[PDB]
Amino acid sequence: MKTIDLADIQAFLYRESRLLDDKAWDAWLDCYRADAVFWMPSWDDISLIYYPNRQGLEDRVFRIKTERSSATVPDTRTSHNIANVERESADGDVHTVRFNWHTLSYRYKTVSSYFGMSRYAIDFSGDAPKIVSKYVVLKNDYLIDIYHI
Amino acid sequence: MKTIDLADIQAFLYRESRLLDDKAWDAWLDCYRADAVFWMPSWDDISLIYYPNRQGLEDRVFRIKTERSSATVPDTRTSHNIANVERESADGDVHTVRFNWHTLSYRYKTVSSYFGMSRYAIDFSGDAPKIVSKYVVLKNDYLIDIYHI
Amino acid sequence: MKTIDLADIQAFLYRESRLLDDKAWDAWLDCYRADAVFWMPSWDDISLIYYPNRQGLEDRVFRIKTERSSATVPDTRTSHNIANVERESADGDVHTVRFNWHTLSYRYKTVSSYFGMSRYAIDFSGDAPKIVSKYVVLKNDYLIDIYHI
Numbered sequence: 257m258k259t260i261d262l263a264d265i266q267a268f269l270y271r272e273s274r275l276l277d278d279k280a281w282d283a284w285l286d287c288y289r290a291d292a293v294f295w296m297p298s299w300d301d302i303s304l305i306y307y308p309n310r311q312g313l314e315d316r317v318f319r320i321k322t323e324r325s326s327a328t329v330p331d332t333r334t335s336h337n338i339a340n341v342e343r344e345s346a347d348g349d350v351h352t353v354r355f356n357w358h359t360l361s362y363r364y365k366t367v368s369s370y371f372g373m374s375r376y377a378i379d380f381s382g383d384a385p386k387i388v389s390k391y392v393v394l395k396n397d398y399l400i401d402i403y404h405i
Numbered sequence: 406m407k408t409i410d411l412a413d414i415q416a417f418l419y420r421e422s423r424l425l426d427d428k429a430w431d432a433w434l435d436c437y438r439a440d441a442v443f444w445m446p447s448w449d450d451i452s453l454i455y456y457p458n459r460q461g462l463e464d465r466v467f468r469i470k471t472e473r474s475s476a477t478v479p480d481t482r483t484s485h486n487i488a489n490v491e492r493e494s495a496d497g498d499v500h501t502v503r504f505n506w507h508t509l510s511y512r513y514k515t516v517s518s519y520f521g522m523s524r525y526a527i528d529f530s531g532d533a534p535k536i537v538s539k540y541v542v543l544k545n546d547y548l549i550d551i552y553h554i
Numbered sequence: 555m556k557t558i559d560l561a562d563i564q565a566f567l568y569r570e571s572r573l574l575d576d577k578a579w580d581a582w583l584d585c586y587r588a589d590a591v592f593w594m595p596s597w598d599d600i601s602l603i604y605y606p607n608r609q610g611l612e613d614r615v616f617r618i619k620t621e622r623s624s625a626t627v628p629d630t631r632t633s634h635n636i637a638n639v640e641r642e643s644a645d646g647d648v649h650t651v652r653f654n655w656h657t658l659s660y661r662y663k664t665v666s667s668y669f670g671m672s673r674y675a676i677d678f679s680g681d682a683p684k685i686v687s688k689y690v691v692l693k694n695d696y697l698i699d700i701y702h703i
Contacts, residue, residue: 262412263560267640269638270638270639270640271640273638274638274640277654277671301478301479301480329599330599331599333693333694334693335654335656335669335670335671335693336637336638336654337486337635337637337638337654337656338637338638339485339486339487339488339637340418340419340422340423340485340486340487341419342416342419342420342423356426356484356485356486358484358486358507358509358656360656360667360669360693360694362669362693362694364696365696367667367669367694369509369516371484371509371511371516372484373426373484395482395483395484395509395511396482396509396511396516398513398514411561450627450628450629486635488634488635488636488637489567489568489571489572489634489635489636490568491565491568491569491572505575505633505634505635507633507635507656507658518658518665520633520658520660520665521633522575522633544631544632544633544658544660545631545658545660545665547662547663
């Protein structure tokens, strides 16, 4: 049995979000299982982002790399802040947690905040954890990319 | 003996604040002992909120429900972020902790931040924890309701 | 052997930052080894702060005390929020960690945010932990003092 606790899960969440903040896009993608679903719903009061597997995320990372390859200073500096992590369930080595988050983002003169809640299912059966499903609720919805969430 | 550690306390703090963010007002009230004191002092440089028992909080929740029962979209979305949790004392099954917090709030176009420190005494003697005392220092004091703190 | 885990490190980080938020300047200085190096680099796209030992920090605390000794209300209220703490290495009783942070600051009408990442090396060999090295990356760099970071 793999014994996985909240601290193990938090360590993974901190690493995953660090890989975005540090623009380590390939390492970041490797935190996701090839069959990972990634879903940020719209508020109907149609998703903001939906990918049924990781390929969609790979393509989006390709777009980000392409945009950045021409781009000059100032860059966008981001800082993820993962809070209030609660374990919801475990099914074998697949662990489901929810958490609140607040990403601060800065380029040049202006700071932007994005905040909300996320639910992750994470497969700990391999030597490195792998996200099986990501669900993101953006609360300040009225652009946003994957490196903000 | 109930052995209660910081993680158990954090789990409770995350749940309590989640019940506000998710507008689960009755479940939220049940995190508080009937004799709970709830105090957010004013800065004299008279409280912003004071209740000597839970009844005052029940009445305030009634007011919130009444306001919401007519209200249309956009709603106010809140996100609590509990940080820097330190245990201060334990007396039997009553555990006292302090922590910093930052609630982000959004309706329509504008994000609001509230931040400060809180001290909780929490009774873990029952099957579910119960807040015995809540003290809240709002640092950006110059409105605010119970779902922001 | 001193067994030190992430929770022990977090407890220390929370205390150290609390001593700044509560303006306990002498107690704060005592979280730092006399030979502590404190470095907040500039972005070259020359540091914002560099001290090769604690004396520089002592002198800066003296300046802060002098400024405050004449100053009237409203004061500046600060609130540190330490997030995403990851242990990087241990060498004997010296433990190195990185973390993200967001300090909120308020005086009078306006809230200011400072955010970024920090790396600490902390010596746990004595009865009280002592910072041996502090490195701070301020992401929203375009004033700031030691009580903001």
